[PDB]
Design a protein around this ligand. Structure first.
Ligand SMILES: Cn1nc(C(C)(C)C)cc1NC(=O)Nc1ccc(Cl)cc1
Length: 331
């Protein structure tokens, strides 16, 4: 066991292994605070996150176990990955705090403020990462600029901290609960549009306004789409709106790469059943300058059967403690 060392960075107190030097608060979340740090064992600049209330309840505990399982499984250039995970506790009895460590990226996809070149490189990496995580039956469902880490080299990694509705696919707005992975593709679509344009494509004020703005572009749902909506509530809402026609994307996005406007068409389709997938998008002619089907790997199988489990805090804690102890760092 390494020798830890304590210190206080504002309201939050930290106790980490000597290996990590010069901690600097970088921001807070409802799930923990993060500190940029120097890992002397690797010379790398890293980010260290201390989970707020690891096991405050059944939900916090389960979430904590989830946070750990996901990050330990992610091993892709365009996805956040675990460098190290540690705890001050020498036993499960004293186990109350979790610290995750990862590569320090710097700025978010928002900060960066884009030449058609960066746009196709940027979105290309998102899709490359999305293909990977999607291949493990994992849906992000919360994709947006702030959850996209980009370095000065324009390298991108998808991640999940913790607006949002501005990027949510319509079938997750209406409160539907049988949505596929392509909800993420819709977010990509919204993000891509924001880069080529410089404006958030759908700046809605609520779940209703947001849905209106969307339809204002993609148009009202036709016979085939209304036909698949279970919720009489939702169905009656949509049908009760002044019919809206689909717009010509070539017009909406004035003078943008024509190949880029075509991909936007395929990503912002209202019916999740006909929306392009991450894998299929990596092959769109728009990414011909970067696509390489030999370097767009899928993930190893991911066991998420725990997601349907209902356990006590100590069990979710025990499972999490095992996970921290069995961790094996990357090369
Ligand atoms: C909840 N979740 N989901 C994913 C994906 C789907 C991107 C693998 C990743 C995460 N979790 C995280 O991204 N967690 C995390 C940990 C440390 C820092 Cl500094 C920032 C973020």
């Amino acid at each position: 066991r390494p020798t830890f060392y304590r210190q206080e960075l504002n309201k939050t107190i930290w106790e980490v292994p000597e290996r990590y030097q010069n901690l600097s608060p970088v921001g807070s979340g409802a799930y923990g605070s993060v500190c940029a740090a120097f890992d002397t064992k690797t010379g790398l600049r890293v980010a260290v996150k201390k989970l707020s209330r690891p096991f405050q309840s059944i939900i916090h505990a389960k979430r904590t176990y989830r946070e750990l399982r996901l990050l330990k499984h992610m091993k892709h250039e365009n996805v956040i990955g675990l460098l190290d995970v540690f705890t001050p506790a020498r036993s499960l009895e004293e186990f109350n705090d979790v610290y995750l460590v990862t590569h320090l990226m710097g700025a978010d996809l928002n900060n960066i403020v884009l030449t058609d070149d960066h746009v196709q490189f940027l979105i290309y990496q998102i899709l490359r990462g999305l293909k990977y995580i999607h291949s493990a039956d994992i849906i992000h469902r919360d994709l947006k600029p702030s959850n996209l880490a980009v370095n000065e080299d324009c390298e991108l990694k998808i991640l999940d901290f913790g607006a949002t509705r501005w990027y949510r696919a319509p079938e997750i707005m209406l409160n539907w609960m049988h949505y596929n992975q392509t909800v993420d593709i819709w977010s990509v679509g919204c993000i891509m549009a924001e880069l080529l344009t410089g404006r958030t494509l759908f700046p809605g004020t609520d779940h209703i306004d947001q849905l209106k703005l969307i339809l204002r572009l993609v148009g009202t749902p036709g016979a085939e789409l209304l036909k698949k909506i279970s919720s009489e509530s939702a169905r009656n809402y949509i049908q009760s709106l002044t019919q809206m026609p689909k717009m010509n994307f070539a017009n909406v996005f004035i003078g943008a790469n024509p190949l880029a406007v075509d991909l936007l068409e395929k990503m912002l389709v209202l019916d999740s059943d006909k929306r392009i997938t991450a894998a299929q998008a990596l092959a769109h002619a728009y990414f011909a300058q970067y696509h390489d089907p030999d370097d767009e790997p899928v993930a190893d199988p991911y066991d998420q059967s725990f997601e349907s489990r209902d356990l006590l805090i100590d069990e979710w804690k025990s499972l999490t403690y095992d996970e921290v102890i069995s961790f094996v760092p990357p090369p």
